[PDB]
């Protein structure tokens, strides 16, 4: 029991942010009306977290997966709780995963979506002002404000776990 | 010749090759701040020379 | 990564990054219109060729 | 967005009031209410060997601890931990243990043991820490478990009524060691000892 209690603070600190990730997962699934699916309903089976081994301290064209599941719904996969936890966990928290790899795809999608939205909305503008407005939309300040007003930064995992020094037990 | 582990060998040599004044000082230091938070302690040592 | 672009477009409505409208929903950005006065759809293809 | 004054300080940051998960809020168990305990199971992944026999064997013993809440947890993903002997797998049981606390002193014993673990076994304690009864943010308990009747498990009351605080390690001189009873192997098997000399 002493050996098992040695690991207790780490387990509790992971459970904290796993519960935050579950909250985010359920909230986003419900907002998309996808919460009634067999995958995402009461029968959700969370897959175990996966080690991101890329981290430093750890004839024919193949169809693209995201586009494959964009047009056909049979390839839709449940949004994993571990994936949301990785999205929340910053690199400063010296955990075994971070938000870096997801951020690349998220940034690319945000840029593409803002570009198409502005092009469809303001089709009678020159390229210069469209580029400027897009740079404003995807700027750090805009994303910062529009995530602060979503009450997300109160649930982020961004500090290294030093239980003895900067941690308050339950 | 006592052992090969240097980390405890330093403690051993310090404990053997010091007068009981230094030994008792170090032991009182160890038992005073065994596993505490460095921000939780603030101490002074007054010596003459 | 989990739901494709069509569902991911709705998230920008959640974060208020892209303001929605009755005429152009966010789910239909894949239906981009190269509209405006800059295009002339009545021109016969011989002039282009 | 018009003003350009705030474009210089690209390296700013802000202070945010953190908030616990909704489950952990107001999760302190109460007398005469149903509370749920989720046992924590540790699965050692590394292959057993002469160096890692103790860590492999001990972690598989069914004397685990749980986490005690008023609120009900969702299903949690299995999680990896890296001990010095290798990798670990930790899972939280999806089916909670449902019990009721019918004694204020019983709850006091539970919460005293919870405070004891951090104060002594893990030494997380600080001079200003206080045992919290406010039943507010981040308030839940940790309780040990032992096998009872059948496959069901229960609270391990004897350890908590015995270990309110860890006894301080004190040596014995020859005089007082003489009449101390002869040590028995059963009293040392699977226990914790320390070299006081």
UniProtKB/Swiss-Prot annotation, chain A:
Tissue: In ovary (at protein level).
Domain of life: Eukaryota
Compartment(s) of residence: Nucleus; Cytoplasm; Cytoplasm, Cytoplasmic ribonucleoprotein granule
Gene inactivation effect: Abolishes RNA-induced silencing complex (RISC) assembly and RNAi silencing activity. Abolishes siRNA unwinding prior to loading onto the RNA-induced silencing complex (RISC). Decreased levels of endo-siRNAs. Increased susceptibility to infection with RNA viruses such as Flock House virus, Drosophila C virus or Sindbis virus. No effect on the processing of pre-miRNAs. RNAi-mediated knockdown inhibits the induction of the antifungal peptide Drs in response to M.luteus challenge. Also highly susceptible to infection with A.fumigatus, with 80% of flies dying six days after infection.
Subunit structure and binding partners: Component of the siRNA-directed RISC loading complex (siRLC), composed of at least Dcr-2, r2d2 and Taf11, which processes dsRNAs into duplex siRNAs which they then load onto AGO2 to initiate formation of the RNA-induced silencing complex (siRISC). The Dcr-2-r2d2 complex exists as a heterodimer and heterotetramer, with the latter showing higher siRNA binding activity. Interacts (via N-terminus) with the siRISC loading cofactor r2d2; interaction is essential for formation of the siRLC and consequently, formation of the siRISC. Interacts with Taf11.
Purpose of the protein: Double-stranded RNA (dsRNA) endoribonuclease which cleaves endogenous (endo), exogenous (exo), and viral dsRNAs to produce short interfering RNAs (siRNAs). The generated siRNAs then mediate gene silencing, also called RNA interference (RNAi), by controlling the elimination of endogenous transcripts from mobile and repetitive DNA elements of the genome as well as exogenous RNA of viral origin. Also acts in an RNAi-independent manner to activate translation through cytoplasmic polyadenylation.
Family, similarity comment: Belongs to the helicase family. Dicer subfamily.
Domain observations: When in complex with loqs isoform PD (loqs-PD), undergoes significant conformational changes during the full ATP-dependent dicing reaction cycle for processing a 50 bp dsRNA with a 3' two-nucleotide overhang and a 5' monophosphate terminus. At the initial dsRNA binding stage, the helicase and DUF283 domains transition from an extended to a closed conformation, this anchors the bound dsRNA through major and minor groove recognition and forms the ATP- and 5'-phosphate binding pockets required for dicing activity. The N-terminal helicase domain, containing the Helicase ATP-binding, Helicase C-terminal and Helicase insertion domains, functions in dsRNA stimulated ATPase activity and RNA translocation during the dicing reaction. Essential for processing endogenous and viral dsRNAs. Binds and hydrolyzes ATP enabling the dicer to translocate along the long dsRNA substrates, and produce siRNAs processively from the end. Some reports suggest the domain is essential for the recognition and initial binding of both blunt (BLT) and 3' overhanging (3'ovr) termini dsRNA substrates.
Protein name: Endoribonuclease Dcr-2
Organism encoding this protein: Drosophila melanogaster
């Amino acid at each position: 029991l002493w050996l098992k209690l040695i690991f207790l603070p780490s387990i509790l600190n992971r459970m904290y942010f796993l519960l935050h990730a579950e909250a985010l997962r359920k909230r986003f699934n419900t907002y998309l009306n996808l919460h009634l699916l067999p995958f995402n309903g009461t029968d959700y089976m969370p897959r175990p977290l996966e080690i991101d081994y890329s981290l430093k301290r750890n004839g024919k064209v193949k169809p693209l997966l995201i586009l494959q599941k964009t047009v056909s719904k049979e390839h839709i996969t449940p949004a994993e709780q571990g994936e949301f936890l990785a999205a929340i966990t910053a690199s400063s928290a010296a955990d075994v995963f971070d938000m870096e790899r997801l951020e690349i795809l998220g940034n690319s999608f945000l840029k593409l979506s803002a570009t198409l939205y502005l092009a469809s909305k303001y089709s009678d503008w020159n390229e210069g002002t469209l580029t400027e407005v897009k740079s404003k939309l995807v700027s750090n300040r805009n994303l910062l404000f529009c995530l602060i007003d979503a009450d997300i930064p109160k649930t982020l995992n961004t500090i290294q776990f030093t239980p003895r020094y900067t941690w308050l037990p339950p | 010749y006592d052992d090969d582990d240097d980390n405890v060998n330093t403690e051993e040599v310090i404990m053997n090759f010091s007068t009981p004044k230094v030994q008792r000082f170090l032991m009182s230091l160890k038992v005073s701040f065994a596993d505490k938070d460095p921000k939780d302690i603030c101490c002074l040592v007054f010596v003459e020379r | 990564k989990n739901y494709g672009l069509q569902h991911a477009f709705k998230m920008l409505e959640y974060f208020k990054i892209c303001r929605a409208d009755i005429d152009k929903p966010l789910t239909q950005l894949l239906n981009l219109e190269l509209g405006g006065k800059k295009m002339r759809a009545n021109v016969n293809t011989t002039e282009i060729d | 967005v018009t003003a350009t004054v705030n474009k210089a300080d690209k390296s700013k940051d802000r202070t945010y009031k953190t908030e616990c998960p909704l489950e952990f809020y107001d999760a302190l168990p109460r007398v005469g209410e149903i509370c749920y305990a989720y046992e924590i199971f540790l699965e050692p992944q590394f292959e057993s060997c002469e160096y890692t026999e103790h860590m492999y064997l001990n972690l598989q013993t069914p004397r685990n601890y749980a986490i005690l809440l008023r609120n009900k947890l969702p299903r949690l993903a299995e999680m990896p931990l890296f001990s010095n002997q290798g990798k670990l797998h930790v899972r939280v049981a999806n089916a909670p243990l449902e019990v009721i606390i019918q004694n204020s002193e019983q709850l006091e014993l539970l919460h005293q043991f919870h405070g004891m673990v951090f104060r002594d076994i893990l030494k997380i304690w600080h001079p200003f820490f206080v045992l919290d009864r406010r039943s507010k943010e981040n308030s839940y308990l940790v309780v040990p478990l032992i096998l009872g009747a059948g496959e069901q498990k229960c609270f391990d009351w004897e350890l908590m009524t015995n270990f309110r605080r860890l006894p301080q390690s004190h040596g014995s001189n020859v005089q007082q060691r003489e009449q101390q009873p002869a040590p028995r192997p059963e009293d040392f098997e699977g226990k914790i000892v320390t070299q006081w000399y």
